Amino acid sequence: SLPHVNVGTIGHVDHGKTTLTAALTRVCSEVFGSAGITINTAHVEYNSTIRHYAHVDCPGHADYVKNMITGAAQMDGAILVCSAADGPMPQTREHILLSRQVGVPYIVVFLNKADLVDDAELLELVEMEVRDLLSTYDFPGDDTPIIIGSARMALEGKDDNEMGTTAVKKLVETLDSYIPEPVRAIDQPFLMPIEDVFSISGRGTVVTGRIERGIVRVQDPLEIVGLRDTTTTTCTGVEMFRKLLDEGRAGENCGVLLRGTKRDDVERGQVLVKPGSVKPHTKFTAEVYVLSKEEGGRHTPFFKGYRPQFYFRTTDVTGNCELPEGVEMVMPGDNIQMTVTLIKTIAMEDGLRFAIREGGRTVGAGVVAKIIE
Ligand SMILES: Nc1nc2c(ncn2[C@@H]2O[C@H](COP(=O)(O)OP(=O)(O)O)[C@@H](O)[C@H]2O)c(=O)[nH]1
Ligand SMILES: [Mg+2]
């Protein structure tokens, strides 16, 4: 019955990510607890005194790109592993960038392989490089907790000079205090993506869907957002399988009974929300992973002016893609940032995920990085 927090290890190949993952389970055991698109992930769990951690680790760079953009769980925090012996390397940079793009709110650093460094100046040098890297992508580099140690010593139950077990312990306690309790879906502002719309003989409207987050109750005031100008409405009932109720909750499939809505003020793909909670937008920055030929996507490389369908929750909307300055094409299996302009408005926030399709043939997965307009 402990608070659930999603974490993971990021950084360059060979810097110690998988080892630190194993050390974390061992150390938490000894000091606290117990123990289409193809994506290789390893999953692990450990408890501190106050939290249950669900921890993801991926083999290679390509896995991190796909998982962070379209992976099963969104990290509430990421542990950046950087080798103190080697200093930062290309995927040290790119994984911080990708964390920014994907909306990972916090990053903690473990400077690994301290057993290999007998040189205070080198540790200082590498720490400064990493703080700078973090600040380059708007993480608070100067205030980032950086723990120095040896994941491998910890994994082997060694703790000479507190480099091993103690350091991984300090890491977990940093997780405890630096990453806030995430807000559960049930406690966020109400949102349901609309699927079907049925007029109750002109006396009201049922809009159906699966509540994505929050709670809706009889008498609640609501807005209908996207595709056309926002309208207001009032909930007068909730239809569930077999039952008419006064309430519906995140996770539940229902029909929300509405009054004050005009037949065609409401359609599929709009979102029913707590008033003032989400706004409609058309233009945004996005990190996109373009599917592989093998993954059932495209074999063709596309160019500037590409106009695919963007799928957001329960509908799709045509959009124009602008590549970054210096790029003319994008091959299958690439991941790039691009600026997108939709033909119609749609409810959206930073961190919202979407699919890209051509004629019902999935070609990309993306996340909204930054809303423009
Ligand atoms: N000397 C030393 N080697 C380490 C440490 N942590 C990991 N390694 C070694 O680095 C190599 C790659 O580590 P691994 O955890 O698989 O790196 P990953 O690719 O980041 O997942 C392995 O041979 C590890 O034993 C450490 O603290 N000290
Ligand atoms: Mg690994």
UniProtKB/Swiss-Prot annotation:
Q: What is its EC number?
A: 3.6.5.3
Catalysed conversion reaction: GTP + H2O = GDP + phosphate + H(+)
Q: Where is this region: G1?
A: 11-18
- Catalytic class of the enzyme: hydrolase
Q: Which positions fall inside the tr-type G domain?
A: 2-183
Highest taxon in the source lineage: Bacteria
Query: What does the entry list under GO cellular component?
Result: cytosol
Answer yes or no on keyword Protein biosynthesis. Answer: yes
**Binding positions for Mg(2+) per the UniProt entry:** 18
* Binding-site positions, GTP: 11-18, 57-61, 112-115
In this chain, the stretch annotated as G3 covers 57-60
CDD domains annotated for this entry?
A: EF_Tu, EFTU_II, EFTU_III
Q: Please indicate if the UniProt record lists Metal-binding as a keyword.
A: yes
Task: Explain the purpose of this protein.
Answer: GTP hydrolase that promotes the GTP-dependent binding of aminoacyl-tRNA to the A-site of ribosomes during protein biosynthesis.
Quaternary structure and interacting proteins, as annotated: Monomer.
HAMAP family (alphabetical): EF_Tu_B
What is this protein called in UniProt? Elongation factor Tu-A
User: What species is this protein from?
Assistant: Pseudomonas putida (strain ATCC 47054 / DSM 6125 / CFBP 8728 / NCIMB 11950 / KT2440)
